[PDB]
Amino acid sequence: GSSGSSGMALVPVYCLCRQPYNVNHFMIECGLCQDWFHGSCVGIEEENAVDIDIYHCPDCEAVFGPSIMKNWHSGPSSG
Ligand SMILES: [Zn+2]
Ligand SMILES: [Zn+2]
Report the alpha-carbon distance of residue 27 to residue 36 in Å, rounded: 6
2-29 residues labelled b (16+ CB within 10 A) or e (exposed): eeeeeeeeeeeebbeeebeeeeeeebbb
Quote the ligand 1 centre to 18 CA distance (angstroms). Answer: 7
Quote the ligand 2 centre to 4 CA distance (angstroms). Answer: 38
Q: What angle do CA 72, 74, 75 make, to 5 degrees?
A: 140
Domain ranges of the chain: 1-79
Report the alpha-carbon distance of residue 76 to residue 70 in Å, rounded: 16
Which residues, at least 6 apart from 12, have a Cβ–Cβ distance to it below 8 Å? 20
- CA 62 to each of CA 6, 10, 28, 50, 67: distance values in angstroms, whole numbers, following the listed order: 41, 31, 18, 23, 11
Identify the CA nearest to 15 among candidates 3, 29, 4: 29
Identify the CA nearest to 48 among candidates 69, 62, 66, 34: 69
Helix (H, G, I), strand (E, B) or coil at 36: strand
Quote the ligand 1 centre to 26 CA distance (angstroms). Answer: 10
Domain at 1-79: CATH code: 3.30.40.10
